[PDB]
Amino acid sequence: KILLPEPSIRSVMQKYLEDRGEVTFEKIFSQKLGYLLFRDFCLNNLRGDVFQKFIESDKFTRFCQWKNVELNIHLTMNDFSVHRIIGRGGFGEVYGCRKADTGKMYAMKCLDKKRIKMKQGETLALNERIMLSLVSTGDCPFIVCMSYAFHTPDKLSFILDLMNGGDLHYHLSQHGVFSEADMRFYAAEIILGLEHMHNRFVVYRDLKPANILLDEHGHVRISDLGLACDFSKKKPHASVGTHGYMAPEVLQKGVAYDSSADWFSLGCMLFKLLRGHSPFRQHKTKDKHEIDRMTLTMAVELPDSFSPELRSLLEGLLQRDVNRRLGCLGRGAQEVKESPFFRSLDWQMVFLQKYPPPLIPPRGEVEDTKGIKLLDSDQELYRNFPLTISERWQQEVAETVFDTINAETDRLEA
Ligand SMILES: Cn1c(CNc2cccc(C(=O)NCc3ccccc3C(F)(F)F)c2)nnc1-c1ccncc1
């Protein structure tokens, strides 16, 4: 449980924050806990007069106490109750967990350092940590975002949004293919996920049904940023992604690309939701070269059963040239949102998750490392791995123990 430090911490914490120019209206009011304590004080022009009277008051003393807790966060496994496995991968696995002090539920992505070392995957693990931190502000509800990162002697841990509903690869195998109306629901939420990423200069690259997870109500998020990169710094030129869901720019060896690659992948994926395979698969051939050449040379071949609105969308998303493709011409994601396929969608209500999802998940049922040492050199690579997202910890506290602990602490101090 969270124990606030005694209110004699105030003067030291105020000097700490003043020296970093963080005792202003813009810095404190924008923070969630800063907003609530300022809101609480006002019930007891605002940039000058009101703000400094708040600084003298012990509602700012309380803000300094919570801030002190924030800055001393040093998570270990001991701070989480880890329950059961809800995902697997090459370097490790994902568990459902409860953070002990607040009781908030999260997904813990636990990667094993010995398995990482053995597969020379150090830069990939660091990359997911970097990519997650870029996309994890703004509390976007259509990406599986990070709140904390930390590591132990033998593990890396990402603390991510919990998704108990399973992925769309799995659900395709049970549900079968989706109708246009049902696909539209997933497209609308996935589009907003990609918009949030593209704003922070992140191209996602691995968009496919397996990376679209469902919550217990059936709303979806883009999951796993291991193959994403920051295209602003240098445009990537590597063939990254999944065969059948890669754009022509990505496949063409040498050619640089940006966010454009995702909109092509969206086309591949939405088709897959309707038809059960990538549009460049043809006869379920497992020949990956046949799949890539069909992508590069031959224009996309759509079945006649598709509505004229859906043809416009897919043909637009699957244009082989970036200069013809939806979401690449100037206005970005907004070009896709304006497609005739989404005529009847209010994108505020998509964002607010008001539309009924077409699949509400049912209920689930219930070595290599031997030899590899872990040197000091290996631990040095993860020196800057630990991280806390201020917004996230504050939002967690706000929705769980803020009022209770504030009340408890007032009794200790009165
Ligand atoms: C389903 N799920 C995945 C799927 N991916 C996954 C799961 C477990 C381990 C790994 C993994 O070992 N990834 C290694 C890897 C593989 C390719 C590229 C980069 C990286 C990494 F960054 F992890 F090094 C991946 N990741 N997070 C979830 C998940 C998130 C929230 N709730 C439920 C599940």
Curated annotation (Swiss-Prot):
Amino acids binding ATP: 86-94, 109
Catalysed reaction equations from the record: [beta-adrenergic receptor] + ATP = [beta-adrenergic receptor]-phosphate + ADP + H(+)
Enzyme class: transferase
Catalytic-site annotation from UniProt: 206 (proton acceptor)
Ranges annotated as spanning the membrane: none
Compartments in which it is found: Cytoplasm; Cell membrane; Postsynapse; Presynapse
Described function: Specifically phosphorylates the agonist-occupied form of the beta-adrenergic and closely related receptors, probably inducing a desensitization of them. Key regulator of LPAR1 signaling. Competes with RALA for binding to LPAR1 thus affecting the signaling properties of the receptor. Desensitizes LPAR1 and LPAR2 in a phosphorylation-independent manner. Positively regulates ciliary smoothened (SMO)-dependent Hedgehog (Hh) signaling pathway by facilitating the trafficking of SMO into the cilium and the stimulation of SMO activity.
Similarity field: Belongs to the protein kinase superfamily. AGC Ser/Thr protein kinase family. GPRK subfamily.
Domain free text: The PH domain binds anionic phospholipids and helps recruiting ADRBK1 from the cytoplasm to plasma membrane close to activated receptors. It mediates binding to G protein beta and gamma subunits, competing with G-alpha subunits and other G-betagamma effectors.
This protein's name: Beta-adrenergic receptor kinase 1
Full-sequence portion shown in this chain: 31 to 538 of 689
